[PDB]
Amino acid sequence: HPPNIGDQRALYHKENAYVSVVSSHYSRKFTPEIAKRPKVRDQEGRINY
Amino acid sequence: VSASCSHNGESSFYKNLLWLTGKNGLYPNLSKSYANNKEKEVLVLWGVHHPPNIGDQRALYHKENAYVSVVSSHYSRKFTPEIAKRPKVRDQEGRINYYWTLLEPGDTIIFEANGNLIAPRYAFALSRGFGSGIINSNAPMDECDAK
Amino acid sequence: KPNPENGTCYPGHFADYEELREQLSSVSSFERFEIFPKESSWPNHTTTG
Ligand SMILES: *[C@@H]1O[C@H](CO)[C@@H](O[C@@H]2O[C@H](CO)[C@@H](O[C@@H]3O[C@H](CO)[C@@H](O)[C@H](O)[C@@H]3O)[C@H](O)[C@H]2NC(C)=O)[C@H](O)[C@H]1NC(C)=O
Numbered sequence: 518h519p520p521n522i523g524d525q526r527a528l529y530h531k532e533n534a535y536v537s538v539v540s541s542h543y544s545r546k547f548t549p550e551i552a553k554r555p556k557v558r559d560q561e562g563r564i565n566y
Numbered sequence: 567v568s569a570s571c572s573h574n575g576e577s578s579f580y581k582n583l584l585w586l587t588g589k590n591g592l593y594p595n596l597s598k599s600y601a602n603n604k605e606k607e608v609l610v611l612w613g614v615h616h617p618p619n620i621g622d623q624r625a626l627y628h629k630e631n632a633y634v635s636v637v638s639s640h641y642s643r644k645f646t647p648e649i650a651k652r653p654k655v656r657d658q659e660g661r662i663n664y665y666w667t668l669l670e671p672g673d674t675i676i677f678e679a680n681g682n683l684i685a686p687r688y689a690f691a692l693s694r695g696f697g698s699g700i701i702n703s704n705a706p707m708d709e710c711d712a713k
Numbered sequence: 714k715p716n717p718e719n720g721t722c723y724p725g726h727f728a729d730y731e732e733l734r735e736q737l738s739s740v741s742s743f744e745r746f747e748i749f750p751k752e753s754s755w756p757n758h759t760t761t762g
């Protein structure tokens with residue numbers, strides 16, 4: 518999840534994106550959310566596991 | 567304002583929340599942030615609007631499609647309104663679904679929407695009590711202490 | 714430790730933390746292997762970030 522859309526364009530070159538993981542048992546689709554939020558460990562953005 | 571709500575024979579709305587509608591024919595994007603300076607765990611209440619039909623959607627929020635997103639340090643979810651015909655309850659054909667989350671001190675909640683968002687007018691700061699669940703009775707209250 | 718000082722070197726949120734703790738609390742055979750080769754799987758994608 519980038520903190521701003523400018524870093525999203527600089528890193529991944531797509532304004533919108535989708536992440537999809539699929540199995541026979543567990544299947545889900547993830548969509549990145551771009552929003553500002555307070556810094557933790559000198560990084561505004563976060564990555565979801 | 568909702569005609570379903572009746573306070574002193576007058577139409578009203580929920581006190582802790584706010585219904586947002588478009589002004590001057592346009593609904594601009596919104597962004598709100600709150601820092602937890604209350605030192606206690608806060609509870610925020612918000613809901614989404616599912617319109618009766620696409621005509622009421624276009625009349626209320628000036629957009630055929632809309633979305634609302636809430637993000638926090640630990641809770642994140644993306645919401646999508648559904649426009650369909652529903653059974654009539656309390657003289658309201660559409661329905662609105664409510665959601666809640668708990669924020670620790672030092673956390674900031676972000677609200678982003680282009681429509682169909684019921685804004686939180688009031689929030690509640692609470693302390694944690696571990697037990698003492700709810701009971702259901704019609705008996706009279708008395709001022710005596712029983713363990 | 715009661716307070717782990719190295720939880721995530723990049724900030725984020727972990728899904729089902731307690732479930733994974735219960736899953737990893739006891740193991741019989743535990744093996745680490747490369748599911749995807751670093752160079753072979755991503756020829757056209759930068760992996761040095
Ligand atoms: C693993 O844990 C250790 C804790 O012992 C981490 O070291 C700590 O790293 C943070 C982030 O850089 C430091 O906070 C910052 O320190 C600077 C001064 O260097 C200060 O100006 C900032 O305001 C901020 O407080 C912290 O001092 C540092 N602590 C120690 C004892 O070195 C380490 O980064 C962790 N490694 C990871 C997460 O990979």
Ligand SMILES: *[C@@H]1O[C@H](CO)[C@@H](O[C@@H]2O[C@H](CO)[C@@H](O)[C@H](O)[C@H]2NC(C)=O)[C@H](O)[C@H]1NC(C)=O
Pocket residue numbers: 532595680
């Ligand atoms: C208000 O929010 C809408 C919804 O996200 C924005 O519309 C998107 O804008 C981006 C960037 O211009 C486009 O790539 C998308 O295709 C747009 N989506 C739709 C459905 O129109 C809009 O730009 C926002 N406006 C402002 C001023 O922030």
